[PDB]
Design a protein around this ligand. Structure first.
Ligand SMILES: O=C(NCCN1CCOCC1)Nc1cccc(-c2ccc3nc(NC(=O)C4CC4)sc3n2)c1
Length: 342
């Protein structure tokens, strides 16, 4: 009949009313997001005199504990990044309000998916793409700090926000899927389109999965459409194979889930199972990017910084991010020294 003395709905969510003031401090403006965790509101901090994004976690033990896991990782990252130059969203405070854990973040702007929607999924320039790429690579180098060793585990355009709607600076959000490098506990991880081959194949993984995800993201930012839009894992892996070919044999011989996608022939070589798809490696990135045809769909023909030479540098960096082998896949430090950023 009544939940949390009337403050909650039947689904454990705080009922957000515009104009409330929590603790004589946070003036609640409006709802700016929601999900299974709970809600996100726009609120004015009266003490600090600034807008904030406040994440109100559901009044439910399971979501409360997952939120505290993220708080620990956010506070751990704040100790290593005062001055805030490695592009991770700043958690500035948390408190309990009417049996809800409230996490106070800095107010950011639109996410990179919204931005893509605003271009009607036709992409943004190689110049803006490069700026995002550098910041994201720098951010991955900071996660790679030995004392952190944090896998985000869910990089995608909706989890990268602009700081200011009129600047190109970005921050990474949502460390709810994130963990520190350790023994393998989880196997169904990452959002399908940005899922890495080692995770699809059921194999050991590390911080390299985030670099795979970044490769996929950057091509999407420039094209507008996801690179590998699988409706299921078998479709996902087939779309990777269209572009990058059959994975190397030394990987597939290890893979527990290889037979979900492939068949080991009597001579010990691998090919696809029948489920449609272009032959292996015949949908070349070179043509998806439009290297010699004026970029994706010809729309960058004659734009500054979209020459063939510029496109081959972008292509080369991306193919290093989409290495099937996570041991030889490009790492943050050397991605930053790639010719694409000079
Ligand atoms: O909660 C998030 N995603 C929910 C889905 N996750 C999927 C996997 O893990 C479970 C949760 N992302 C997230 C996490 C922490 C902080 C924020 C955050 C920070 C600032 C911010 N600013 C926003 N919007 C604005 O300022 C204005 C409207 C443009 S949205 C927003 N979100 C987002």
């Amino acid at each position: 009949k009544v939940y949390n003395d009337g403050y909650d709905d039947d689904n454990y969510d705080y009922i957000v009313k515009n104009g409330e003031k929590w603790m004589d401090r946070y003036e609640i403006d409006s709802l700016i997001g929601k999900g299974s965790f709970g809600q996100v509101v726009k609120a004015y901090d009266r003490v600090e005199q600034e807008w904030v994004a406040i994440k109100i976690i559901k009044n439910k033990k399971a979501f409360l504990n997952q939120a505290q896991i993220e708080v620990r990782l956010l506070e751990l990252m704040n100790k290593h990044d005062t001055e805030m130059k490695y592009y991770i969203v700043h958690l500035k405070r948390h408190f309990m309000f009417r049996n809800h854990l409230c996490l106070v973040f800095e107010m950011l702007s639109y996410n990179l998916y919204d931005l893509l929607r605003n271009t009607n999924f036709r992409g943004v320039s190689l110049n803006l793409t490069r700026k995002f790429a550098q910041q994201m690579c720098t951010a991955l180098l900071f996660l790679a700090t030995p004392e952190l060793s944090i896998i985000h585990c869910d990089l995608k355009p909706e989890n990268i926000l602009l700081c200011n709607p009129k600047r190109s600076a970005i921050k990474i959000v949502d460390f709810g899927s994130s963990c520190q490098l350790g023994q393998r506990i989880y196997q169904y991880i990452q959002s399908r389109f940005y899922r890495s081959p080692e995770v699809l194949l059921g194999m050991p993984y590390d911080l390299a999965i985030d670099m795979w995800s970044l490769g996929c993201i950057l091509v999407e930012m420039h094209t507008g459409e996801p690179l590998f839009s699988g409706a299921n894992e078998v479709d996902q892996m087939n779309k990777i194979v269209e572009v990058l070919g059959i994975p190397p044999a030394h990987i597939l011989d290890q893979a527990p889930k290889a037979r979900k996608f492939f068949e080991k022939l009597p001579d010990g070589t691998w090919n696809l199972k029948k489920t449609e798809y272009k032959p292996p490696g015949t949908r070349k990135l070179h043509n998806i990017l439009g290297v010699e045809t004026g970029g994706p769909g010809g729309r960058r023909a004659g734009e500054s910084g979209h020459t063939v030479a510029d496109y081959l540098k972008f292509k080369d960096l991306i193919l290093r991010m989409l290495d099937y082998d996570p041991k030889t896949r490009i790492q943050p430090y050397y991605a930053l020294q790639h010719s694409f950023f000079k």
